[PDB]
Every structure is written in structure tokens, then in C-alpha cells.
Amino acid sequence: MDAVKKAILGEVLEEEEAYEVMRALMAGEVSPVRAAGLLVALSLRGERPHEIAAMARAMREAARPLRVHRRPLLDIVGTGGDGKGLMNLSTLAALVAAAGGVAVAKHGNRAASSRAGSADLLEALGVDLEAPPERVGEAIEELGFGFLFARVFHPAMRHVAPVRAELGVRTVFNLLGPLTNPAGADAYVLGVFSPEWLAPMAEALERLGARGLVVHGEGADELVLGENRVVEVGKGAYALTPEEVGLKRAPLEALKGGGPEENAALARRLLKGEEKGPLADAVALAAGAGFYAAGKTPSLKEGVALAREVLASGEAYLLLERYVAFLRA
Amino acid sequence: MDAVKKAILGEVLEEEEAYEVMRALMAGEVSPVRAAGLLVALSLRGERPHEIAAMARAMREAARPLRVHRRPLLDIVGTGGDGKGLMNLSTLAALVAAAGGVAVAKHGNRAASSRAGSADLLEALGVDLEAPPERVGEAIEELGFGFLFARVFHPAMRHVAPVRAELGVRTVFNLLGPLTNPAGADAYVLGVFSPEWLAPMAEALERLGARGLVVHGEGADELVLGENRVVEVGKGAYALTPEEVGLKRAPLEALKGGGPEENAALARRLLKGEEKGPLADAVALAAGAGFYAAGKTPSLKEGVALAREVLASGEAYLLLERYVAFLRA
Amino acid sequence: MDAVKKAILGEVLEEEEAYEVMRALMAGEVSPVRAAGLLVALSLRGERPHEIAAMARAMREAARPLRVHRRPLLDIVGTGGDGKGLMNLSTLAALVAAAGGVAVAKHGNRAASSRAGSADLLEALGVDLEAPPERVGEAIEELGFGFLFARVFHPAMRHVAPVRAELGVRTVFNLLGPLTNPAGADAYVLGVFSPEWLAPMAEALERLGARGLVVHGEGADELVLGENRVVEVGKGAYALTPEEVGLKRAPLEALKGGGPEENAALARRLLKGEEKGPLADAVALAAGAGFYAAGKTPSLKEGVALAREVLASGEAYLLLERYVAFLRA
Amino acid sequence: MDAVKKAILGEVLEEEEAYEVMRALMAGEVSPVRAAGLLVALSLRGERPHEIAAMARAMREAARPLRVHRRPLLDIVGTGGDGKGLMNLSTLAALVAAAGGVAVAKHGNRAASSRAGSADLLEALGVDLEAPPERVGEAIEELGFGFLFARVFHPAMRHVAPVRAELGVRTVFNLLGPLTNPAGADAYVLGVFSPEWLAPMAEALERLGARGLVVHGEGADELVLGENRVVEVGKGAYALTPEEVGLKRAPLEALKGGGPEENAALARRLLKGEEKGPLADAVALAAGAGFYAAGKTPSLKEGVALAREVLASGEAYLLLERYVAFLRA
Ligand code: NA
Ligand code: NA
């Protein structure tokens, strides 16, 4: 009985076995049926800290190599799996943070069976997702921004994706994605689908030597214009509200956005500093948290203040275009 | 919520949700990945009787139709896979019960290897496994015996066979095999893989409107010549030893079989009433349980007594001969 | 399993082995690595007609079941992979054939990534690609036309698609796509990406009990306004030119088109009988081949004549809207 | 078109395209799926010498560094997997050559079965496989012998080892193993699994600037006591029989070892100069070929004579003991 069978049988895995299971998955040695079975089994009983850590290690080792010489290196990313179906603002917040001087390496992917993933949005904005890791790394060093497409850095994710899409439920990959930034990001604004994961993911980041905030927004895996719950690595837990940082509250519905084409249009207007509603406020909130997490500003309020200025300046769109041109070289 | 997704989430399904999941599976509507996921989920958190019975009804509905007017209708069958490599005791016990006057419709299949399964044994004895359902039904009506070859009656199982093989672990389908008698048998001596399945399977039978005994014998999914554990549908669990029904104990080794021709040779001696060793005692034990389960005898003791006489008469061999000829007519 | 290794070693598979290999692939029993190895080996060695037909059967069996009474049932479909990048006219020709009185079940998919696949075009024209299989079946019975979206009918392809995309080269799946119509179409105008596949594919069609024409047009997997090469089931190989059916030749460039948006408007003008250029002639040629293949017209020229009349009448556009509305709640 | 895709398409690679493909593979830039595809394609069409040599250099470049000043430096190694399952005598022959004064750096690995790989045998004899490269290099300089454990010197093989095992068939890596000596050995007795590989591998050796003999013995990838086929770098092809060098012929079966423990026992007796049968003659034959390949003796005959003397003296066992102690120091 190999480690995969043990996992399917629902038995807790020793660190070495957890590592082996993910190594096999990343190596393309596991059939779709057994991959589906092991993911469901792990999701039912709940993956333990040592298991997640071991699987994360297997993923980092299987990743296409990339070394970025800029630090702090910020990632604004979420676990996904919240079901709220809100627009993915992390990508826009990440661009604002980069336009403000923070080195950014945002980790993202395509959305299951919607064109809404961060990778989908960026592609619609002109980003060539096929660009090699070395070119993306050069962009981060020279321009301060880079988008790390999951499938490119972790090839196996191309096969894991359909399995996750079909199962249609949360799996260990929802937790592993944020924890496996392939550029070695050390600063985070990491959103989670449930408050239960705020502390665990913050502790995971701390063990990795990373810093930042783990966030949850009234059900969504991103900061929203409401009573957000946060856990700052090394410090503790606290609430983060819009009024706290000079922003107004808005229902979650105001952050839903629309179809892929509409969101692509919204993105341009937002980055250009033309769109001014709740969507702009939410991007400013996340970017502000990013400036704080990356040490660009000493506080969240100063971070949000800077983010509002940067967003309104339209510099984030100018940066996006520099990025697009850089990759098309 | 979608029934299949609910299953994958690890939630207990309402009875008709369980029916729907199995209906979808048998209809070829579920993808291999989702089928793998929901089978693993159901197995890990444990299938409940009302789910098991509902899925058995859905599977029975997808089978090739066959209506038998005779009742009670007995089946001696098990969940299989106990890896004991025993002689086809239930097949011989079924022939004995039929020779004793009880209408029998024994459900079976081939064994995936050189070892002989019930279908392999009967084929070696002259049974034409290609006989159409209608002909087998006529045999039950006229001769009181029929063998229901799973491959002929359950074409829909081809939709899940590959997934079951690849998972490499037992699933709800192992439980459903004996609960999907295509002739609608209502009396059973149903063997299970382990003691933990005695009660759930007994309740599933009760919910299906059936009667009888669910049995387990020292690792084997059938009654053996040792300490058996049984659950009488509608009553409760109790132990069943050879001595309390007038038989002597014997090790499992004494009940081992081999290939089709070897088992056929043994079957001939046993059914003719010529071989009186442990194999004969084991057949009498299962057939006796069958007589009791069908209400032919008032007790297990009287059932075993009747079975010993029927076996010794050689009449079960005559019945087999007539059955073989009937399918060839 | 064993047959998979045999394929990887470059050996020709027996019919049963080919069926088993594809059955395993579609069932999710093959790891990405072994799937990649098998597909490359098959492609380099050269798939034989008996293998192709056997694998088509395995795929047809794994698909979401759909049975329709309408016959003859026509499909105009291609293997893709010609790298010619011409406008996919098969969809328009199919609508014309249906408007002319032939039951049509056109098999199609989205295109990576022009969004220039048949599914992409129909969606832009108003077709709800999320319609359930049963509803599409009802459309074929009631309206005489249905579009079979590969993603809906072949869910098992979800775990296979990633391997194909990563390999980035043509594989046996290019050949199987046209041979796995989920509605059981029996009449075809099947385009192939290279002349060497005309004969093998015609034999595959015959082995599957289908009829019609396998076509290739100066590099494209569709009939064009030049010297087409054809292999008709039951007749053999021959060339087919526009002039012999009353049409004028035109450069392939005239059949290109553009962006998805341009082709939607293009498609409308063609179906309404407004566009009269080479594109209209090419649609008439394919639709005409369809009428002949299905038995609606006794000759190819008569089929083209009927297609030209139908196109000019605008009835194909009315059919499209009838279909679009049919799928709406 | 990138080189990996070209390989997958079955086209012969230009020398530097082959170097690039292997460089990418060793750098972790190639996905398991594309790696699987290219390995199968290369194996089926047949790797050419210019490709093999280039890939060997790319692999050598990725290995952990190890500079040995002593020259000539001899290696006695094979491609493995011939199926004959004979005892791996190359290790013993290497020790004899070293005891005879030739600097030896024998390249080896484990044998997942019977873990009777060369590394398995040496470990059973006391060698600490965890010894760092520097220590092994010091042993070669001081003792004249060193065993290069592939897993220690080729950490980059972690990017492909999984794919190799998963494919389960021979690939170019079988050929590359003997051609990637991490100490830069320049003299060889290289065994191949089939005679068709003699000339290509001899050319690959010459291309790499190496000298020696490429051998094949009646189905085995080692010199046997029968009609051996040889291709000598800078000399050409010829047959080599035992009688030509003063040895007696013996059936292959006399050269068959046993399990790992039996081989360790036989190895001890041989090195001590105690075993005097065919196994001793076979060791002398290979060691003699090594002496000649390294330029220690003027002919194969004198090389075998020197080898028989050294073997009988027991000096090779004493060397082994010194080596084991040296590593444990
Ligand atoms: Na007798
Ligand atoms: Na005709």
C-alpha cells in the first residue's frame, strides 16, 4: 500500500508520506481517479499542519526555478473557495502596490469554469501567460511587478485544475496555492475562505519567515468594505473596517462586478483612476494593506492613503502597460 | 444542492438524494473524477442503510428486467473480496435449497483470475452463461432454480467498473452487489466482508422488504465451520457455531477450492452426495441458513438437517443437470 | 496497464487492446506521464484504422448518453489541427443542411484561443452552451438541429485535455473528435488536416457503420474553393472542384475571416442570404456535400444547388433563431 | 519551434538542440508531461551519436563538481537492464584494475530490484554511500579507487527519475548513465544491452574525448565467457572470445549471481582470490579489458593476464577494505 492508497483510506499521513503524495501528484504519476480520491479523503478529515507543510515543500521543490533579487517581495493572494463569487481584486491591488514602489510577485491562476481568474483578467489586458519564468523575474526586478501563473511554475497544476474543477469543493490546493509563491515572496495580504484559517495560515507564514496579514472579509477570501477579520504575522488578530482607514462601507454585492469582458473594462477604468465607486475603495483597501505588509508605509491608514493617491494617478495602468510590453519582447 | 456535490462534501444524503446519485451514475451522467470522489467520500464517512437501500433500488432499475412470480425467492450471496479462495459454497448451497423446494435465483459473477467464481464454476458444469434473461426466468419458474450472471443483467456497471478498479479500495458498490438481485429475490443469506457490516446490511435488506440472515465467518463473506456472526433481519445479532446445528468444526483450509475444473469436480461429488467431508458440512450450513431465511424450516437446526438430507439424496445434482439442459433447449 | 506499455513501446495494438487503452484513458486510470507517452508513441508510429475505430467506440461509450430517433443524422465536422486558421464554416453549412430538411447534430467545441471554435461562434450568436444534453436532444427531434458541445457530452475529456495541450502537437484525439459524435450521427462531411488521413478515416467511418465524405481542401480540414481531395465511403478517392458543381474558385485567403466579433456579423449576413461572396460559395459547397452524404439529394451538384437556394432564402438564419429561443427558459 | 517540441514531433535534433533539451530537463524547466513525450519520441526513432554526446555534456555540467588530477582515469560500467539479470561484475573488475595501479572512478547506482545494483553491492560490503563528493575524490587520489554514487553526484536527476520509472521503459537515460561519469573518467569498458548500440556508443565516447572499449556479450551488457562483440574507440569493431585471452568459455548461467546477500558473499570470495570458477574468469576478462583501455597493458591478452594475477593475490579485497575504512574515517 503506497502513500496514495493510505491517503484514500483516510489515514493521517506521516510527514514523509504527505510529501510523497504531493511529489507524485506534481510528477504526473497519479491517475485522475486516484488524484480525485486522495483530494476528497484529505478534505473530509482535514489536513493537519505537518501534512500541509510537507506537501508545500514537495510543491516548492517541483516548481520551475526562479530567483528574484528584490525584497520585501509582496503577494496579494487568496485561497479561493469562498463561493461569494466576487470580482478578484487582488490583481489590481497588486498593480497599485507596485506602482507605489513595492516589489510585487502576485501568484494567480485561471478560474475553473468561469473566465475570472486573475490569470484570465491579465490575459484579457494583454499579458502573455506563456512568458518564461526568467522573463517574469526580470520584469519584477526592473519594473517592480510580475504575475506568477500557477500552471507555468507548477506544470502539474494543468492536470490538477480539471480534477479540482470537477470535484467542485475545497481541497488542500486551496491552502497550498497561497503558500507556494514560486518567486519566494516574503510579504503577504493572504485571504482565506473561512475565519478558521486565519491563525493557521498566519502561523504557517511565520514558520516560513514571511510577514504580513492573513485576511477574511465577511465570507470572502479578500478584504471587503465591511468588518474584516485579520491576523498579522507575529502580532495577533484584529478587525479592519473601512471607516478605520477613511473608506465607506458598501455591501458585498457592490464588489461582485460582472462578466469577464465587463470586468476587463472595469479593470482598465479602475487602474486609470477613472472608476470611483466601492470597487475602487476595495482595491485601495487591499493595496493599502499591501503597502503596510511590505513595509512601504508604517501603518494601514497611511497605506490606504497612499493607495488612493496611486490609484487616482493612473500610474497602475501605465505600469500594467510597461509590464505587457516587457513580456512581449 | 447538487446531490453528487453533497456526497463529495461528506454530508449524509437524504434517501431520494442517494437514489438520484446512483441513478445518475448508472445512467452514465457522472464524470469519472466525480464518481471517484463521491465513492471515496461515501466510504470514508460511512454509508447509511437508507442510502444503501435507495442506491440498490436505483441499480435494480437500471438492470435488464426480469419478473419472477414465485415467492419466497432465495439468494445466497456475498459482498465478495474476502480473499479466502474458498470453494463456491454459496452456489452449491443454492442448488441444494432449490432441490429442497425453495425457489432460488442465485446472483453471481466470474472471479477476476484463474480461481473459479460462481459463474466460472457453473460454466464448467455446462451452464450457458449467454442464456437470455427470459430463459433464466422460465427456468426459475419451472425448475425452481436460476443463476443470474451479473455481466448479463448489469450492463450499466460498465460505467463505473474502471473507476472501481483504479481506486483500489472497497466502495458502496461492494455492498450493492448482493442487494441488486435482478430477479427480485426477497429472502437472503447475505455474506459480508467484516462484522461491522452485518447490521447496516441487515437494515438495508429490511428497508428493501427482504428477510433473512446477514452473515460473516472468520474473515470469509460466508458461513464457515467455525465461529460465525449473524444478524437476522428484524431481530438482532448472535453467534452461530457448527455444533449447535449438528456439524463439526473444520479449518478454512479444508474449504479451499481452485480452478473451474477442480471446483466442478468437487461440485459433482458434493451434489451427488458422495463427498461427505467438511465441504459437505459447509454447504449444508449455508443451505440450512437458506431454508430458514426463506421460511421453509422453523429453525436453523431444522434447516441444516433438511440440507444434509437433500445433499445426500443426490437430487441437487439432478437439478443441476436439468437446469443445464433447460438453458440448452 | 499492459496494453499501455505495448503502445508506448511502439507496437501496433489489436482492436481489443486499442479499445482498452482508450477506455482506461477516458476513465481516468492513466497518469499524465503515461498518457503523454502513449499519445506520442501512437502518433509517431501511425495509428491504424482498426485502432482508430476501436478507440472511437471507447470514447463514444464514455460520453454522456444521448439517443435520438432522427435519421439520417448529419454532422459536418473537422479534425482541426490544419494551422490554416480559416473561418470554421462547418457550423453554417450544418445550419443550412438542417434548414433544407436534413436532421443535423453538429459536434463542436471552443477554440484555443481565437475563441474561434464552432461553440464560440454559436455562443456569440445566442446559443446557451449550458443547455442540458436532454434539451439538445429534444431540439434535434423537434427542430431538426442540435449543436453538441464537446465539453458537455465528453466530461471525461476534462482530465485528458491538459495532457494534449501540454504536448502541443496533434494526437489521435484530433482524429477521434469527428468520430465521436454523441448523438450517433450516421452521415458525415468529415474534414481532415492532411491528405494521408483521408483513406484511414473513411475506413474508420465505415467500421463505425457511418457513411459520407472525408474531405481535405488544399491544406484545410474543410472543403474549400479549390482542388479538394475526397474519399467517399463506398466509392473511394477522387478530387472535387468548385467548377464541377457550378461554383467559382477563390483563394483560401477569401475564406479566412477575422476576429470572433467579425465572424459573428459575417455569420449573420451569410445565413440571412445577404453575403454572396466566396464565403457563401464555400458554405454552399459543404452543405451540398452534406445533403448528398445524407441522401437528401442524389448528387453533389444537386446538393450544392439546394444549399444555394436555402442560403439565399435566409431560412438558415430563421432556424438559428428558432434554436436559440428553444434553449431559453 | 522549441527543441523539446521538435523532439516530440520525432525529428532528429541538431547537436546543440539536443544539448538544450537536456540542459532544460536538468534545470527543471521541462514539465513531466513534455519530458515523457520527448523521452518516448527519442527512444522510438533512435537517438543518434551527436545527440547522445551533447546530452551527456549537458548532464555532466549539471552534476556536482569533482576534479580528479590522476589520469588515465578508468570506469567499467554498463547501460543496464539487459534482462539477463547476471551478477554486476563491473564493480569487482574496477577494484582489480585499481589494485593493479590504474586510477579508477567507477560510476554506479542502486537497483530498485534486486537492489543488486552496483551501489547496493558495495553498501553491503561496507561502503558508506552518504560519503560527500570531496571525500570520494580524496579516496581516488590517495587510494586510486572511488565509487561515484549517481544519486549523490546527479541531484538534478530528481527532475526526471520519476518520469523514467513511471514510463517503465528504456530511454536515452540508459545510454547517458555510462556517459556521465562525474569524475571525468577518460578510459572505459562500457557495456551495452544490444549490439546495435556498440557503434553509436563508441562514437559517443570518442565525441566526449574518451577512449576504451564498448562491449556486448551474448545478450548481456558486460563481457561474458562467449563470443563478445566489441567496438574499440580509434580501432574499430571485432569479436572477442575467451580463448583469445587464455580463458575458457562457460554458459551465461555460470555468471548469474543470486540475491543481494548472495552476491556480496560471492564478491568477497572473488576479491579475496578464493573463487576460481567462471565468475573469476569473467572478472579477469573485464578487468583485463580495463587495463588495456587505460593503456596499462599493451594488449587485451596481457591485461587479462595481469588481472588474473591481481585477482588471485587478494589485493583487490585489501583495497576494498582500505576504501571502506577511508570513507568511515
Ligand atoms: Na452417498
Ligand atoms: Na445517394
Q: How far is CA D105 from CA A105, C245, D61, D98, D187, in A?
A: 45, 76, 18, 9, 10
Taking the CA of residue C23 and the nearest CA in chain B, the distance in Å comes to 8
Question: Taking ligand 1, which is a single-atom ion, which protein residues have CB atoms under 5 Å away?
Answer: B 273
Partner-chain contact B33 A8, CB within 8 Å = no
Q: Would you say C194 is a known binding-site residue?
A: no
Residue A126 at interface with chain C, using a CB cutoff of 8 Å: no
d(CA D140, CA D143): 5
DSSP secondary-structure letter at C12? Answer: P
Partner-chain contact C8 D169, CB within 8 Å = yes
In this structure, the strands spanning A145-149 and A103-108 are parallel
| Claim to verify: residue B44 and residue B184 sit in the same structural domain | no
| Chain C touching partners, 3 or more CB pairs below 8 A | A, B, D
Sign of the dihedral defined by the CA atoms of residues B224, B225, B226, B229, in that order:
positive
d(CA B189, CA B175): 14
What does the block give as the cell for C286? 459543404
What is the rounded end-to-end Cα distance, in angstroms, of chain C? 46
Q: What are phi and psi of B240, to 5 degrees?
A: -135, 110
Nearest residue on chain A to B1, alpha-carbon basis: A168
Residue in A34, A40, A163 closest to B166 by CB:
A34
Partner-chain contact A33 B31, CB within 8 Å = no
| Claim to verify: residue A45 and residue A72 sit in the same structural domain | no
B67, B92, B111 - which closes a domain: B67
What does the block give as the cell for C55? 478507440
Q: How many A/D residue pairs have CB atoms within 8 Å? A: 33
Alpha carbon of D323 to ligand 2 centroid (Å): 85
Partner-chain contact A28 D29, CB within 8 Å = no
Partner-chain contact B44 A39, CB within 8 Å = no
Binding residues of B: 78, 81-82, 88-91, 106-114, 118, 164, 221-222
Taking the CA of residue B200 and the nearest CA in chain A, the distance in Å comes to 20
Partner-chain contact D163 A28, CB within 8 Å = yes
Residue B36 at interface with chain C, using a CB cutoff of 8 Å: yes
Residue in B10, B41, B163 closest to A33 by CB:
B163
**Residues in Cβ contact with B35 at an 8 Å cutoff, skipping those fewer than 6 apart:** B25, B160, B163
Strands (E), A42-135: 73-78, 103-108
Q: Would you say C82 is a known binding-site residue?
A: yes
Nearest residue on chain B to C25, alpha-carbon basis: B162
Q: Which amino acid is at B151?
A: R
Question: How does DSSP assign B106-122, residue by residue?
Answer: EEE---SSSS--HHHHH
Would you say A237 and A198 are in contact if contact means Cβ atoms under 8 Å apart? yes
Give SS3 for A106.
Answer: strand
| Claim to verify: residue B77 and residue B35 sit in the same structural domain | no
d(CA A241, CA A249): 8
C328: burial class by Cβ within 10 Å (0-12, 13-18, 19+)?
Answer: exposed
Residue in C28, C64, C65 closest to B32 by CB:
C28
- Preceding amide of A278 cis, omega within 30: no
Query: What range does the domain containing A305 cover?
Result: 68-329
Q: Would you say C2 is a known binding-site residue?
A: no
In this complex, does chain D touch chain B, defined as having at least 3 beta-carbon pairs under 8 Å apart? no
Q: How far is CA C329 from CA A190, C132, C141, C325, in A?
A: 40, 12, 18, 8
A48, A67, A86 - which closes a domain: A67
Residue A10 at interface with chain B, using a CB cutoff of 8 Å: yes
| Claim to verify: residue A199 and residue A313 sit in the same structural domain | yes
| Chain C contact set for A162 (CB, 8 A) | 158-159, 161-162
Q: Is D246 left (phi over 0), alpha (psi -120 to 50) or beta?
A: left
| Chain B contact set for C29 (CB, 8 A) | 162, 165-166
A contact residues 274-293, partner D, Cβ 8 Å cutoff: none
Resolution in A: 1.5
| Claim to verify: residue B26 and residue B168 sit in the same structural domain | no
Q: Which amino acid is at B156?
A: A
Q: What is the CATH number of the domain that holds A122?
A: 3.40.1030.10
Alpha carbon of B220 to ligand 1 centroid (Å): 28
* Element holding A192 (H helix, E strand): none
Nearest residue on chain D to C45, alpha-carbon basis: D44
**Of residues C47, C44, C42, the one with CA closest to residue C6:** C42
Alpha carbon of B287 to ligand 1 centroid (Å): 18
What does the block give as the cell for D57? 555534456
Partner-chain contact A27 D32, CB within 8 Å = yes
Alpha carbon of C185 to ligand 2 centroid (Å): 17
What does the block give as the cell for C94? 450544418
Instruction: State how many domains chain D has.
Output: 2
In this structure, the strands spanning A236-240 and C145-149 are unpaired
**Of residues B18, B46, B16, B51, the one with CA closest to residue B203:** B51
Maximal CA-CA distance, chain B: 61
Ligand closest to CA B271: 1
Determine the number of helices (DSSP H) and then strands (DSSP E) in chain D.
15, 7
| Claim to verify: residue C60 and residue C114 sit in the same structural domain | no
Q: How far is CA A26 from CA A58, A174, C310, in A?
A: 8, 15, 54
Report the DSSP beta bridge partners of residue D216: D229
Ligand closest to CA B313: 1
Question: Taking ligand 2, which is a single-atom ion, which protein residues have CB atoms under 5 Å away?
Answer: C 295
C-alpha angle B213/B215/B218, rounded to 5°?
Answer: 160
Partner-chain contact B163 C28, CB within 8 Å = yes
| Claim to verify: residue A89 and residue A57 sit in the same structural domain | no
D17, D45, D67 - which closes a domain: D67
Sign of the dihedral defined by the CA atoms of residues A11, A14, A15, A17, in that order:
negative
d(CA A201, CA A172): 13
What does the block give as the cell for D133? 563528493
Would you say D215 and D188 are in contact if contact means Cβ atoms under 8 Å apart? no
d(CA D97, CA A99): 67
**Residues in Cβ contact with B56 at an 8 Å cutoff, skipping those fewer than 6 apart:** B176, B179, B180, B204, B208
| Chain C contact set for B158 (CB, 8 A) | 61
Residue A23 at interface with chain D, using a CB cutoff of 8 Å: yes
**Of residues B210, B263, B180, B257, the one with CA closest to residue B73:** B210
Alpha carbon of B321 to ligand 1 centroid (Å): 18
| Claim to verify: residue A19 and residue A165 sit in the same structural domain | no
Q: How many CB atoms lie within 10 A of CB D292?
A: 25
**Of residues D122, D117, D78, D73, the one with CA closest to residue D98:** D73
Alpha carbon of B310 to ligand 1 centroid (Å): 11
Assign 3-state DSSP to chain D and report helix, strand, coil percentages, each to 5: 50, 10, 35
d(CA D64, CA D73): 18
Spell out the SS3 assignment of A279-298. HHHHHHHHHHHHHHHCCCCC
Taking the CA of residue B26 and the nearest CA in chain C, the distance in Å comes to 11
Ligand closest to CA C232: 2
Q: How far is CA B254 from CA B90, B224, B276, B278, D212, in A?
A: 16, 10, 12, 6, 64
Q: Would you say C307 is a known binding-site residue?
A: no
| Claim to verify: residue C62 and residue C79 sit in the same structural domain | no
Nearest residue on chain D to A159, alpha-carbon basis: D33
| Claim to verify: residue B93 and residue B192 sit in the same structural domain | yes
Q: How many A/B residue pairs have CB atoms within 8 Å? A: 68
Q: Sheet containing D187-191: give its strands across.
A: D145-149, D103-108, D73-78, D187-191, D211-217, D228-232, D236-240
d(CA C268, CA C280): 11
Would you say C49 and C204 are in contact if contact means Cβ atoms under 8 Å apart? yes
Residue in A29, A64, A159 closest to D162 by CB:
A29
Alpha carbon of A310 to ligand 1 centroid (Å): 100
Indicate which technique resolved this structure: X-ray
Nearest residue on chain A to B10, alpha-carbon basis: A44
Burial annotation C99-129 (CB, 10 A radius, 16+ → b, else e): bbebbbbbbbbbbeebbbbbbbbbbbbebeb
D contact residues 143-182, partner A, Cβ 8 Å cutoff: 158, 162-163, 166
| Claim to verify: residue D16 and residue D119 sit in the same structural domain | no
Q: What is the CATH number of the domain that holds C4?
A: 1.20.970.10
Q: Is D278 left (phi over 0), alpha (psi -120 to 50) or beta?
A: alpha
**Of residues C171, C173, C170, C145, the one with CA closest to residue C157:** C173
Ligand closest to CA B317: 1
DSSP secondary-structure letter at A168? Answer: -
| Claim to verify: residue A247 and residue A147 sit in the same structural domain | yes
**Residues in Cβ contact with A325 at an 8 Å cutoff, skipping those fewer than 6 apart:** none
Would you say B144 and B104 are in contact if contact means Cβ atoms under 8 Å apart? yes
Report the DSSP beta bridge partners of residue A217: A220, A228
Partner-chain contact C36 D33, CB within 8 Å = yes
